[PDB]
Scaffold this active site. Structure first.
Site, PDB file in Angstrom:
ATOM      1  N   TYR A 181      37.205  37.861  34.757  1.00 21.25           N
ATOM      2  CA  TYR A 181      35.817  37.657  33.695  1.00 21.25           C
ATOM      3  C   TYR A 181      35.581  36.251  33.470  1.00 21.25           C
ATOM      4  CZ  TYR A 181      36.018  42.837  32.303  1.00 21.25           C
ATOM      5  OH  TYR A 181      36.019  44.082  32.112  1.00 21.25           O
TER       6      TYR A 181
ATOM      7  N   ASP B 142      44.639  46.713  28.403  1.00 19.62           N
ATOM      8  CA  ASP B 142      43.476  46.800  27.770  1.00 19.62           C
ATOM      9  C   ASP B 142      43.913  47.501  26.048  1.00 19.62           C
ATOM     10  OD1 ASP B 142      41.880  45.939  29.455  1.00 19.62           O
ATOM     11  OD2 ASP B 142      41.275  47.788  30.386  1.00 19.62           O
TER      12      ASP B 142
ATOM     13  N   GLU C 253      38.638  33.973  33.688  1.00 20.61           N
ATOM     14  CA  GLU C 253      40.049  34.487  33.726  1.00 20.61           C
ATOM     15  C   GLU C 253      40.794  34.016  35.104  1.00 20.61           C
ATOM     16  OE1 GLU C 253      39.324  38.728  33.033  1.00 20.61           O
ATOM     17  OE2 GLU C 253      40.477  38.437  31.026  1.00 20.61           O
TER      18      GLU C 253
ATOM     19  N   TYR D 231      26.929  48.479  26.364  1.00 23.49           N
ATOM     20  CA  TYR D 231      26.961  49.307  27.333  1.00 23.49           C
ATOM     21  C   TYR D 231      27.390  50.588  26.672  1.00 23.49           C
ATOM     22  CZ  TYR D 231      31.960  49.090  28.324  1.00 23.49           C
ATOM     23  OH  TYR D 231      33.293  49.096  28.290  1.00 23.49           O
TER      24      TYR D 231
HETATM   25  C1  LIG Z   1      36.608  47.961  25.879  1.00 27.47           C
HETATM   26  C2  LIG Z   1      37.596  47.777  27.197  1.00 27.47           C
HETATM   27  O1  LIG Z   1      38.666  48.501  27.185  1.00 27.47           O
HETATM   28  N1  LIG Z   1      37.179  47.140  28.257  1.00 27.47           N
HETATM   29  C3  LIG Z   1      37.701  46.923  29.211  1.00 27.47           C
HETATM   30  C4  LIG Z   1      36.866  47.191  30.483  1.00 27.47           C
HETATM   31  C5  LIG Z   1      36.450  48.600  30.781  1.00 27.47           C
HETATM   32  O2  LIG Z   1      37.377  49.438  30.759  1.00 27.47           O
HETATM   33  C6  LIG Z   1      35.325  48.828  32.054  1.00 27.47           C
HETATM   34  O3  LIG Z   1      34.229  48.047  31.737  1.00 27.47           O
HETATM   35  C7  LIG Z   1      34.968  50.490  32.041  1.00 27.47           C
HETATM   36  O4  LIG Z   1      33.855  50.519  30.895  1.00 27.47           O
HETATM   37  O5  LIG Z   1      37.556  46.841  31.937  1.00 27.47           O
HETATM   38  C8  LIG Z   1      38.360  45.775  31.817  1.00 27.47           C
HETATM   39  C9  LIG Z   1      38.511  45.270  33.388  1.00 27.47           C
HETATM   40  O6  LIG Z   1      39.313  44.426  33.561  1.00 27.47           O
HETATM   41  O7  LIG Z   1      37.815  45.518  34.326  1.00 27.47           O
HETATM   42  C10 LIG Z   1      38.889  45.237  30.740  1.00 27.47           C
HETATM   43  C11 LIG Z   1      38.265  45.522  29.389  1.00 27.47           C
HETATM   44  O8  LIG Z   1      39.146  45.040  28.486  1.00 27.47           O
END
Ligand SMILES: CC(=O)N[C@H]1[C@H]([C@H](O)[C@H](O)CO)OC(C(=O)O)=C[C@@H]1O
Length: 370
Positions: free
Chosen positions: A327, A46, A348, A179
């Protein structure tokens, strides 16, 4: 045991010099073509996000197939010294303006860091286009006008990811799901909750919608028949949380946990939901895609809801893809070659090494209905 036979299955994004995660799909009806966005990350992590790429796909009628054009960077979608992530497209049917909302986080500052530091450094951004994504405007950091006062009440936030919504209310309002990690307790760690950014003047100015039942993550919203805004959200529980709003997304009066819609162990996985005209009492039904495996992220399934928003009405899933799936983002593409509702799905796949495009009709996924 095989996946569902569909109208199309093509890999639109693949790992290479960059990795690509977090898909978004937008169906421009007047064009009969789709807009697929995704994060171009230097790695699969991320914090290694960088910019947002785009690919326009045009649905050919004679062949009932879609043809994508070369991928490209939405160069404008980004703030100086910040990375871009969480693309959330939305087409304003009235002004014909294309909106791409995204997140801008300083260099490689992680999400985790903002959380345990309770210091929000994420920024709500957006870019518009009046030529179907061919050219974009200068990025517009809405952080101040949309969040303002509350910015300090959140450890961090994010929009979508995925397509947004435009209600059929008197004013045709734009609804950007989201969120936020709210600082509620001095000791207890901030708990995230879903909510929507609202706008009734076609993007001129925004407003924060109110939150839902504690512990809700990334989410999407859809309108359905009086007029409601059903929202489906990712939760750290072991099932999806959904909620209904009767005041155009300003508040969610009803909020339940749907056990038929499972979530992988850690903190669940982003899923997607949309509504479409009902083939046969209610004017529309809902379709949802998300991994069906309960231990890991695999076997993306499609769920049907013929009596939205009754939780128990959700159907058992149909296998859309075997193995590693994460996703995804759905889109109502109108009438399909076989006279059934047509769907566009971006998901994904394979340990995040490719993002696949799927296209199928309601008759292919749920023949039982016919
Ligand atoms: C903005 C951001 O970093 N979103 C990330 C999201 C987030 O960490 C989780 O929803 C907790 O809020 O997690 C994931 C994931 O593969 O599950 C990838 C996303 O890129």
């Amino acid at each position: 045991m095989a996946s569902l036979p569909v109208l199309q299955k093509e890999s639109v994004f693949q790992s290479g010099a960059h990795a690509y995660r977090i898909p978004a799909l937008l169906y421009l009806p007047g064009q009969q073509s789709l807009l697929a966005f995704a994060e171009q990350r230097a790695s699969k992590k991320d914090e290694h996000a960088e910019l947002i790429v785009l690919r326009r796909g045009d649905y050919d009628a004679p062949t009932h197939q879609v043809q994508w054009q070369a991928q490209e960077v939405v160069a404008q979608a980004r703030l100086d010294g910040h990375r871009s992530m969480n693309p959330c497209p939305l087409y304003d049917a009235q002004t014909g303006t294309l909106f791409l909302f995204f997140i801008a986080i300083p260099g490689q500052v992680t999400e985790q860091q903002q959380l345990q530091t309770r210091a929000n450094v994420t920024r709500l951004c957006q870019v518009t286009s009046t030529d179907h994504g061919r050219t974009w405007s200068s990025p517009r950091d809405l952080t101040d006008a949309a969040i303002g006062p509350a910015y300090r009440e959140w450890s961090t936030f994010a929009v979508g990811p995925g397509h947004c919504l435009q209600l059929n209310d008197r004013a045709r309002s734009l609804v950007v799901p989201a969120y936020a990690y709210r600082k509620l307790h001095p000791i207890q760690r901030p708990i995230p909750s879903a909510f929507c950014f609202l706008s009734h003047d076609h993007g001129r100015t925004w407003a924060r919608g109110h939150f839902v039942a504690q512990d809700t993550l990334e989410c999407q919203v859809a309108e359905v028949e009086q007029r409601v805004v059903t929202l489906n959200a990712r939760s750290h529980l072991r099932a999806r949380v959904q909620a209904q709003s009767t005041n155009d997304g300003l508040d969610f009066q009803e909020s339940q946990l749907v056990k038929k819609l499972v979530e992988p162990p850690p903190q669940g996985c982003q899923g997607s939901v949309i509504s479409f005209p009902s083939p046969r009492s209610p004017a529309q039904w809902l379709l949802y895609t998300h991994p069906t495996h309960s231990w890991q992220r695999a076997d993306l399934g499609a769920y049907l809801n013929p009596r939205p928003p009754a939780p128990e009405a959700w159907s058992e899933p149909v296998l859309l893809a075997k193995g590693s799936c994460a996703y995804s983002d759905l889109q109502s593409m109108g009438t399909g070659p076989d006279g059934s509702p047509l769907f566009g799905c971006l998901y994904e796949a394979n340990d995040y090494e490719e993002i696949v495009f799927l296209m199928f009709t309601l008759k292919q996924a749920f023949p039982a209905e016919y």
